[PDB]
Ligand binder design. Structure first.
Ligand SMILES: CC(=O)N[C@@H]1[C@@H](O)[C@H](O[C@@H]2O[C@H](CO)[C@@H](O)[C@H](O)[C@H]2NC(C)=O)[C@@H](CO)O[C@H]1O
Ligand SMILES: [Ca+2]
Ligand SMILES: [Ca+2]
Ligand SMILES: [Cl-]
Ligand SMILES: [Mg+2]
Length: 530
């Protein structure tokens, strides 16, 4: 007699440290959000951000877009039996407010205050008009007041025995190499859930992963798999995958690099364009990603997923700078004044200084690693000296947060409209803060651009959104702020050996991936049956 264990892989680790604190995204385990702490609403981003109501049953914006009310579902219990109510929501937002350390999404710059209207209704007051704020609100973890009010210091609290609202709150097994997370005994949506436990094995990199997945040892994964047909697909007809289109991937350059020679090059827009034209994006896609991507030749990073949003006069004006043109790259370096003056074949800065660009991508992310090595070779052909680095994710991340890096290859989260990409990638407000992610850390700062970003949802009118879009697109393309390469894919592999009900090509219910930060994975696990 065997419980239905579902084997998932949301995040690389070399060893598991027991940490289920949903506010500490950089050091916690990646089954905490959604699976332990259910959100108020899941927005189905693949289906136009259609709201799927979970712990909330409704929300409504005020007419001036300066406040919003959430109705809380009745009958819901924490895993320890205690009732879930508006108090828990109000508490959670007050906690993040007082301790900005715990704000990983930037909610503190939208919500000025939160109040309980009654036991199942919460009101949010805004600092500024935002018709999209319910989406932002839904990113904040909601935790139980009767536990966290008694917590010491939440920013170091490891929360080893979690009390949660989600489907899997019980820590059945924990070891450095394996943990098993089982059904919440008081789960409100238990009738809808047919999986008994989440089984989470320790896997450090894509190499260790490839061995395990081809051998049929996984159920639900979202890792890069090299040569997936001959390696994994051909291993069994039970081995399936579905890779729908995802977000932008780019080389991001540090505008505040402390080295004089490097700073001179990186902050030069002719240099960023020459760098960009040296890249053979299609070769990166074919070789490093085995076809799993689309060329991104928008200087703004927009991508072909959102070409309806594109001001095509802006896109075509700067398109040439974001296509493969090695002769053009060499000519631009020459015109700009990046001349090789010490006879080694690599261009030097206008002030005569030699330099090498260190390009980083995360350890274990072999598709990104191979991308950077291909770029290093393509750059050398036009006389730009570069070297690849593959630091551990925490080191990669910290070096961006601190501004010590030169160039970083990174992907971005992908929304229902271009705002998820553009805001996270360019809003200068997101360049400061301990909880802040890496995405905005080039430290290019443009007050006009921030102004446009912060006004994107001042109205409900989508035609005025589209025009703000066009303004944003123009600013970023004009300055070639990053070097966009491709639009990636939501890599997703599923095994029909032990479970059915999977999302796929024929059943495209939403983003199918198992990563933290994909709230839809809650809704996906609810569709699975043994
Ligand atoms: C936007 C973002 O940061 N996404 C992260 C994912 O990219 C990442 O998944 C990893 O992506 C690598 C690059 O394509 C893959 O090589 C790697 O196999 C994959 N790892 C896993 C476990 O799926 C995840 C996890 O590191 O974090 C996301 O936030
Ligand atoms: Ca179900
Ligand atoms: Ca030289
Ligand atoms: Cl563009
Ligand atoms: Mg059930």
């Amino acid at each position: 007699a065997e419980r239905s264990e579902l084997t998932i892989h949301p995040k690389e680790f070399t060893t598991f440290v027991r940490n289920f604190n949903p506010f500490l995204g950089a050091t916690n385990l990646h089954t905490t959000t959604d699976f332990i702490y259910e959100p108020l609403v899941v927005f189905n981003e693949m289906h136009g951000n259609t709201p799927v109501f979970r712990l909330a049953e409704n929300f409504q914006m005020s007419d001036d877009l300066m406040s919003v009310t959430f109705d809380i579902r009745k009958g819901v219990k924490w895993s320890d039996g205690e009732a879930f109510t508006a108090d828990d929501v109000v508490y959670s937002f007050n906690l993040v407010k007082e301790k900005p350390e715990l704000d990983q999404s930037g909610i503190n710059s939208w919500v000025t205050g939160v109040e309980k209207v009654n036991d199942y209704q919460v009101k949010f007051r805004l600092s500024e008009a935002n018709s999209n704020v319910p989406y932002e609100i839904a990113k904040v973890p909601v935790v139980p007041k009767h536990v966290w009010s008694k917590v010491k210091d939440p920013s170091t609290f490891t929360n080893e025995n979690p009390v949660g609202s989600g489907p899997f709150t019980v820590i059945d097994t924990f070891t450095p190499q394996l943990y098993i997370q089982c059904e919440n005994p008081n789960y409100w949506d238990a009738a809808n859930l047919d999986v008994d436990c989440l089984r989470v094995p320790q896997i450090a990199n894509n190499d260790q992963f490839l061995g395990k997945v081809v051998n049929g040892e996984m159920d639900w994964t979202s890792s890069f798999v090299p040569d997936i047909d001959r390696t994994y697909a051909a291993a069994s007809p039970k081995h399936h995958y579905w890779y729908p289109p995802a977000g932008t991937q780019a080389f991001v350059v540090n505008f505040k690099n402390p080295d004089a020679a490097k700073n001179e090059a990186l902050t030069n827009v002719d240099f960023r364009r020459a760098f960009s034209m040296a890249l053979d994006r299609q070769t990166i896609i074919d070789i490093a990603f085995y076809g799993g991507g689309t060329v991104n030749d928008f200087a703004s990073g927009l991508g072909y997923a959102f070409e309806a949003w594109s001001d095509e006069k802006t896109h075509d004006k700067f398109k040439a700078y974001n296509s493969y043109n090695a002769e053009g790259a060499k000519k631009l370096l020459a015109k700009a004044g990046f001349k090789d003056v010490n006879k080694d074949g690599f261009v030097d800065t206008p002030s005569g200084k030699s330099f090498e660009l260190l390009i980083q991508s995360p350890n274990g992310a072999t598709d990104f690693n191979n991308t950077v090595q291909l770029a290093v070779e393509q750059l050398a052909e036009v006389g730009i000296k570069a070297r690849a680095r593959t630091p551990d994710f925490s080191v990669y991340n910290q070096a961006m947060l601190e501004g010590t890096y030169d160039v970083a290859y990174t992907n971005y989260f992908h929304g229902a409209d271009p705002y998820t990409y553009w805001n996270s990638a360019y809003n200068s407000a997101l360049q400061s803060g301990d909880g802040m992610p890496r995405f905005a850390m080039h430290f290019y700062k443009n007050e006009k651009l921030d102004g446009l970003l912060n006004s994107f949802y001042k109205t409900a009118d989508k035609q005025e959104q589209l025009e703000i879009a066009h303004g944003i697109q123009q600013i970023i393309a004009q300055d070639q702020v990053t070097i966009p390469v491709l639009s990636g894919a939501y890599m997703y592999q599923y095994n029909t050996t032990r479970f059915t009900g999977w999302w796929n090509e024929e059943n495209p219910k939403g983003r199918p991936n198992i990563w933290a930060g994909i709230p839809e994975r809650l809704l996906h696990v609810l569709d699975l049956k043994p």
